[PDB]
Design a protein around this ligand. Structure first.
Ligand SMILES: Cc1ncsc1-c1ccc(CNC(=O)[C@@H]2C[C@@H](O)CN2C(=O)c2cccc(N)c2C)cc1
Lengths: 103, 88, 138
């Protein structure tokens, strides 16, 4: 079962998919191939919860029916500087006010 | 390589599969160092464009029962402007 | 050209709406004129009486947005057990989906008041319609 995600850190957003049966560590290996930082220098989060390496994405609550192509689930990411930085995700820009003609 | 970077007007960096980004003729032309800057497309719009790529690849021919692609009213005009520029 | 054949050979069909839209079935008569039929709510099915060689198309009842039937535009009942007509949403282009959302929020008299290029005002005004889809025809 495929799950569709947004792996987010600061102003970086990775759009990727993974199997529900795949692990948190295997997702760090995906991040490594893109951002060139090893899994030991990474922390993955579901909201404020730190995810354990050996757990499947499905056990972590990333399911095919919630982590959808058109509405992907967010995975937080923090790197180790050696100490890990606090989890920080920059919000996307705010949409302008609806035009009078649209309200 | 396998991924490309799409940067919004407000500096958000969106990393997507090259094959997903190449679905847009505009992006394909802009790529040909695996990075494209969109000076007029803000993050609340570009994030939706990336979600569309995933949706299109997943649901094109087919597996049956396609869900609606959602667009909040507040983003609709700017997303229309971007879809028109990107030929999406 | 695009018209039903007067076969007079009955063919039972299941119109199965697997879209989140209210569906308008449209029968193309013997002169090729579109005849609207009763609507189908979102996830409903109807066992209907049609004929071999008769032509049908399916639209969103409120906006006339194009729908697919058995992954194509036109449905022709064949020799029968009823023939299953699976009505679904197409994967609309992002531009077409955006045009659909804008049209649902703005009155046609107010399209001109939007701060967009003229070509987009024309795209908004060129709302889906059966007649334009029928022509062509090629
Ligand atoms: C209940 C429902 N919900 C959605 S649609 C729908 C519905 C309702 C009634 C019918 C009855 N079947 C037909 O009217 C078929 C259909 C076509 O094949 C034309 N046709 C003919 O009897 C026919 C034949 C010759 C000439 C002409 N002029 C007609 C109308 C069918 C569908």
């Amino acid at each position: 079962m495929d799950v569709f995600l947004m792996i987010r850190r600061h102003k970086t957003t990775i759009f990727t998919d993974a199997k529900e049966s795949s692990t948190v560590f295997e997702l760090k290996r995906i991040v490594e191939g893109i951002l060139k930082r090893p899994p030991d220098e990474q922390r993955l989060y579901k909201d404020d919860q730190l995810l354990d390496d050996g757990k499947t994405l499905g056990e972590c609550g990333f399911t095919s029916q919630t982590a959808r192509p058109q509405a992907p689930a967010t995975v937080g990411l923090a790197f180790r500087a050696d100490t890990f930085e606090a989890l920080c995700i920059e919000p996307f820009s705010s949409p302008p006010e609806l035009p009078d003609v649209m309200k | 390589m396998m991924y490309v970077k799409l940067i919004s007007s407000d500096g958000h960096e969106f990393i997507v599969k090259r094959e997903h980004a190449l679905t847009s003729g505009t992006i394909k032309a802009m790529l040909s160092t695996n990075e494209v800057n969109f000076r007029e497309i803000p993050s609340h719009v570009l994030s939706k464009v990336c979600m569309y790529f995933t949706y299109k690849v997943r649901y094109t021919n087919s597996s049956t029962e396609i869900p609606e692609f959602p667009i909040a009213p507040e983003i609709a005009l700017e997303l229309l402007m971007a879809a028109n520029f990107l030929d999406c | 050209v695009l018209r039903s054949v007067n076969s007079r050979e009955p063919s039972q069909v299941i119109f199965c709406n697997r879209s989140p839209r209210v569906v308008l079935p449209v029968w193309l008569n013997f002169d090729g004129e579109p005849q609207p039929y009763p609507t189908l709510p979102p996830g409903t099915g109807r066992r209907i009486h049609s004929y071999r060689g008769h032509l049908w198309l399916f639209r969103d009842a409120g906006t006339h947005d194009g729908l697919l039937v058995n992954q194509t535009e036109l449905f022709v009942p064949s020799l029968n057990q009823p023939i299953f007509a699976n009505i679904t949403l197409p994967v609309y282009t992002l531009k077409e989906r955006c045009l659909q959302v804008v049209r649902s929020l703005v009155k046609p008299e107010n399209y001109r008041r939007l701060d967009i290029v003229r070509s987009l005002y024309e795209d908004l005004e060129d709302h889906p319609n059966v007649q334009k889809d029928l022509e062509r025809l090629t």
